[PDB]
UniProtKB/Swiss-Prot annotation, chains D, E, F, G, J:
Signal peptide: none annotated. Monomer. Gene3D superfamilies: 2.60.270.50. Belongs to the aegerolysin family. GO terms for biological process: symbiont-mediated hemolysis of host erythrocyte. This is Ostreolysin A6. Coiled coil: none annotated. Keywords: Cytolysis, Hemolysis. Disulfide bonds: none annotated. Has hemolytic activity against bovine erythrocytes at nanomolar concentrations in vitro. Promotes active pleurotolysin B (PlyB)-dependent permeabilization of membranes rich in cholesterol and sphingomyelin. May play an important role in the initial phase of fungal fruiting. The keyword Translocase does not apply.
Length: 38, 237, 49, 135, 135, 135, 135, 48, 48, 135
């Protein structure tokens, strides 16, 4: 029964969570809609 | 005669997306860390807000689509039957600038100018107005969803001043306002649009909107005020 | 949150342009490439509809 | 008889909706514009919403050669105020009596109603335009 | 008869002056507003200018209880270009026929004229409202 | 007849004085409260000021067992601006008709007037309560 | 007969609910406001809660041309005190006897009831406003 | 600001906000406006 | 005329939340420490 | 009778579609071109779209040796403007009365309609070409 605490305490899992969710990247509010920035 | 239409849609966001059609297996997979995703956002910060203050103020100022200038006004002669005087920009609009409509404000009027040139894939902040197709002397927006803040008291001239410089605004530039009726009778009833007060502020331009337009096929009655956050004053430009 | 050095350099270069219109266009490009908003509170999990 | 007829043109000059209710032709018949033969039912107008800048026409007249005139009533009500009554309209163009009758009653104060064009001396009641506005 | 009547409302929906000329009722009589007994001469309207954003009413009706309708004509003329014709209007509400006539002839591309409210089936000619606008 | 009667209650729901003027009963007679036999002259009410937050009652009725209704008029007038008219009130409860009349004409944007309790279908005109308020 | 009628306007001026119970028209019929033809059932008012500042109208009258008058009874009760009786109301406008009757009985002491507007000499009973308040 | 009419002949209470107006913050006090129709009583600018 | 409306809601707080639709398995999992959660609060103190 | 006949050739000279609606032959019968015996139904033309540069022919005439003439009506409407009426056409070639009738009514201003070729003195109504164009 792991939670976000177990993910955040592990650098590999924490960085996987950060990367797979684009948490370091902003959002482009284009006229066609919001898209994550690369 | 008989008709039947069936539409089914599944959406998954997080969990094992390969189990979208098997609800039990997706629920079983919701405890796996490798599939956790962002399911809602409760706070969003403008990227410019992340900058240090001296740079932040400059960036905020430079992102404003419109410049602003306060100009003198002149009462438009005629229109003696109306309960409120109608005012228009005094003199000619300076080159590159534009005006926004007729106002009851006898002190000043607002002139605006775009800050960004026209480019492909960019919606301009301002739009030109054209004479109506039929039974209407009122201007019409060249682009679909744009708006203008006042009705025209006179004949809208597409190609000559002051009608040549009247412009409409992108919808994100305006917020709904509140009317203020004048005149005892519908034949002489004019609204003085005023900003809706809030704790996103809008200009108190006191734009004039005649409720009963004599013609037919008239455009929708303007109900909006211009946002203060979209206009840059004292820019030195 | 510390801004990435590349974004800060982009902002500085955009503000270093000679004329106001060049600054505005450089800023438009920068925010088209980097985004206009950043998510500062996010909820993690899974939702099926 | 077709000699007795009335046209009512409700014109919502205001900026908020107004609803018709309790439309009832006690005498004569309603009909489609330009065709007194094409009778229509009161349900075609009951509960209708007159959007701002919209015009709604109600045509009534006597039946085929009958000695009846025409008579009817309806209500304008405010859909945004729990269907609170705005006005009560009564029209009567009798075949026997020469004088007609067009009566507007009610006391709603946040509305302005202005009716014009009726004829009360003799003949048909005519065309009546009723401009409605909400303050 | 008084049953044959017509009201013509000239309403300037533009911003330029328009003049009424050559108003003449060959059959019937011009009369006052809401008073078919108060005959008025055509001189009351001939040469008059309908200022923009106001209405001028012309009331015509047949002789009292007679076997005579009301037939007439007038010109609407632009005074800004030496009193050229805008349109020629002819109305005929006869007593011994069913088909009323309302003809707007003439050509002037600088003016746009609309009209509504007329009835040509049977009975009176009604209240015709004519909106005029110089483009 | 006494069957034709009307009670008019002027109730000041505001904070400014209102005056009654030109009270005149062309048909019938003004009388006392709950006593149709005690005739009272119009001088008892003409010129009176209805102080805010109190009511003034006017009782009118037809002649005893006669073929006569009660018809009358009065003005409500604001004394604060040189006795200008607020509204003109006319009531008619006839003996030889069914349609009673209760007309509140006139215009004064500085005053708001509501009224309720009237009956126009048949019989007496009832107890009409009129709330007056200066804005 | 329609000549005998009564209107009862219960007005809860107080700040707590009051309930109608045992409404019963022993003679005549109840009806909707302004339409003596539109008969209504006692169930439309039985058990109704008059919220504070709310007004409830009950209209009764004789039947169509019958020699009957009208007569009825009801109760005001306190929903917050186990439906304890507040007052008992009886109304009677007979067709034969000239004198009417409006009787309020009961001994509830934590309530104030004030009724006004009834007519007892001759003709219809009239309109009676009943202001209710709980101490 | 003041809060209303009172039967207290000794004193009345005056209040003043301690926090300025800011985005996303419900103010402690609200302005009152003249009634729309048939009422001389004030009405609250904010709902509750 | 006919109308039918059905609304079903499940809520889990503690235990194995992946067994929300299987009552027996959630009841079996209630003895596992790793899933124990706060199910009510009987005392709250202002932070000040 | 076949001696009374009419041909209507609608020619959409403009560049946008025009739709036929409410086609109705109240007297006589429609038929295929060149064959008055080959009767056709109004549904063969109802709702039809006349594309630009397209020509549509409607042939009507009296029945077989009957003393009837022919009479009919239809509407041109704009499919691109919510079926807004462009024009209303009425044709009548009576067998008894010598004079024919071809009437075009309507006030659509963004359209030009030009009809030519009708005969109104005596005999059949003839062939009428109606050129339609949208401004």
């Amino acid at each position: 029964g792991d939670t976000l605490n177990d993910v955040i305490q592990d650098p590999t899992r924490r960085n996987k969570l950060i990367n797979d969710n684009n948490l370091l990247k902003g959002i482009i509010m284009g006229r066609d809609g919001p898209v994550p920035s690369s | 005669s008989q008709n039947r239409k069936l539409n089914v849609k599944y959406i998954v966001n997080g969990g094992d997306y390969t189990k979208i059609q098997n609800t039990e297996e997706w629920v079983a997979s919701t405890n796996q860390s490798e599939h956790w995703r962002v399911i809602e956002v409760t706070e969003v910060t403008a990227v410019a807000d992340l900058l240090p203050q001296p740079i932040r103020g400059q960036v905020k100022d430079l992102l404003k689509p419109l410049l602003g200038k306060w100009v003198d006004v002149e009462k438009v002669p005629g229109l003696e039957s109306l309960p409120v005087s109608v005012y228009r920009p005094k003199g000619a609009i300076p080159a590159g600038w534009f005006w926004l409509g007729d106002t009851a404000d006898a002190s000043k009027a607002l002139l605006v100018k775009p800050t960004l040139p026209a480019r492909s894939g960019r919606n301009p902040a301002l739009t030109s107005l054209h004479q109506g197709s039929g039974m209407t002397e009122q201007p019409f927006v060249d682009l679909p969803q744009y708006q203008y803040l006042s009705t025209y008291f006179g004949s809208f001239a597409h190609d000559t001043p002051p009608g040549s410089t009247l412009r409409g605004l992108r919808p994100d530039h305006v917020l709904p306002g509140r009317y203020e009726m004048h005149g005892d009778t519908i034949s002489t009833a004019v609204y003085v649009t005023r900003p809706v007060d809030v704790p996103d502020e809008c200009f108190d331009l006191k734009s004039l909107v005649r409720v009963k337009l004599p013609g037919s096929g008239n455009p929708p009655k303007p109900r909006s005020a211009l946002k203060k956050s979209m206009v840059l004053f004292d820019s030195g430009e | 949150i510390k801004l990435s050095p590349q974004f800060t350099s982009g902002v500085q270069a955009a503000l270093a342009k000679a004329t106001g219109t060049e600054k505005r266009e450089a800023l438009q490009n920068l925010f088209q490439e980097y985004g206009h908003v950043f998510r500062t509170k996010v909820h993690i999990g899974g939702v099926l509809s | 008889a077709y000699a007795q007829w009335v046209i009512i043109i409700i014109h919502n000059v205001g900026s908020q909706d107004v609803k018709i209710k309790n439309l009832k032709a006690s005498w004569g018949k309603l009909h489609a514009d330009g065709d007194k033969d094409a009778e229509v039912s009161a349900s075609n107008y009951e509960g209708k919403i007159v959007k701002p800048d919209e015009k709604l026409q109600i045509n009534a007249s006597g039946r085929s050669d009958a000695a009846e005139g025409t008579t009817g009533t309806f209500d304008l009500v405010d859909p945004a105020d729990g269907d609170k009554q705005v006005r009560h309209f009564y029209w009567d163009s009798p075949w026997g009596s020469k004088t007609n009758t067009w009566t507007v009653s009610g006391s709603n104060t946040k509305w302005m109603i202005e009716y014009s064009g009726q004829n009360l001396d003799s003949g048909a009641l005519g065309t009546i335009t009723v401009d409605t506005l909400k303050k």
